[PDB]
Amino acid sequence: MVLYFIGLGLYDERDITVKGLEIAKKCDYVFAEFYTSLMAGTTLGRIQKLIGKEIRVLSREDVELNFENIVLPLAKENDVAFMTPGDPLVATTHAELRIRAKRAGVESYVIHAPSIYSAVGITGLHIYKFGKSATVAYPEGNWFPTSYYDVIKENAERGLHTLLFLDIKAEKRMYMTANEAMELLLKVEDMKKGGVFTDDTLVVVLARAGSLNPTIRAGYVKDLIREDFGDPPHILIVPGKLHIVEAEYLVEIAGAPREILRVNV
């Protein structure tokens, strides 16, 4: 008689929580979307096999325009689950769907799963030091998004780290790489000339968090701009002022140049 929002986790089907799996196994109907993020280590089948149910995958349009016509009607007389990559309410507009559920007289519950937002901890950067986050969006036609550049500036001015979600166009099989993000940022810097993002800027790249062997790299843009970080998904991070131990981790674990060990306090 309820609707469950269940996160699938970072990388593969095993990133779901035990709680999420046991509840998903007993739901009458299971829906999911795979446009808000990319789970590079699994397939729909592997997820269906684990949960033991057929899964109706919905498009962005099905959800944003027809969630109350496709999913909610069933939750009024059945236990329904809506599954998503990572945590269902992180960097998505899915929270608003709980409002739609309420208006349709449907109770909803949320089962969390590991999210890229907290996975940044594996970069060695203190998570409490992250400031406002942003998304590097693909330019479209004459429209060239740039607000994410200002976020970095605002955070850097405060000595805070900046988490940059990268764009995704699932229907086009498009997943922005950290390289493409760095190129776009260099272009905005050329236009705004704020000294925010240059070839000498230290950045951190995290690719395929959740996998056992994610790619964790730190260094200057000039050096990483063309480095191969492996398959998507990727996130780009622009650190603010570093603590001694953050620099030590970036060097020992992320292969950063030993020169960043020397911090200018």
Ligand X SMILES: Nc1ncnc2c1ncn2[C@@H]1O[C@H](CSCC[C@H](N)C(=O)O)[C@@H](O)[C@H]1O
Q: Which amino acid appears at position 128 of this protein?
A: Y
- 63 labeled part of a ligand binding site: no
Q: What is the C-alpha to C-alpha distance for residues 260 and 254, in angstroms, rounded to an integer?
A: 12
Which residues have C-beta within 8 Å of that of residue 140, sequence separation ≥ 6?
Answer: none
List the interface residues with ligand X, window 105-164 (CB under 6 A): 115-118
Q: Using CB under 8 A, which of the segments 32-40, 59-67, 106-114, 178-186 binds a copy of itself? A: 106-114
| 166 belongs to an annotated ligand binding site | yes
- Return the range that interacts with ligand X (CB under 6 A); candidates 65-73, 142-150, 196-204, 206-214: 206-214
Residue 36 binds ligand X (CB under 6 A)? yes
125 is in an annotated binding site: no
Q: Is 224 annotated as a binding residue?
A: no
Tell me which residues in 81-100 interact with ligand X (CB under 6 A). 85-87, 90-92
Which CB, 114 or 219, lies closer to Na ion?
A: 114
By CB under 8 A, what part of segment 44-103 binds a copy of itself?
A: 50, 86-96, 98-99, 102
209 annotated as ligand-binding: yes
Tokens of 93: 């507009």
Would strands 107-111 and 80-84 be described as parallel, antiparallel, or unpaired? Answer: unpaired
Q: Is 230 left (phi over 0), alpha (psi -120 to 50) or beta?
A: left
Binding residues with a copy of itself: total (CB under 8 A): 65
Distance, CA of 109 to CA of 122 (rounded, Å): 29
Q: How far apart are CA 64 and CA 254, in angstroms?
A: 39
- Cross-strand pairs, 81: 4, 30
Is residue 33 a contact residue for a copy of itself (CB under 8 A)?
no
Kindly list the residues in this chain that would bind ligand X in the complex (CB under 6 A): 10-11, 36-37, 85-87, 90-92, 115-118, 165-166, 168, 206-210, 233-235
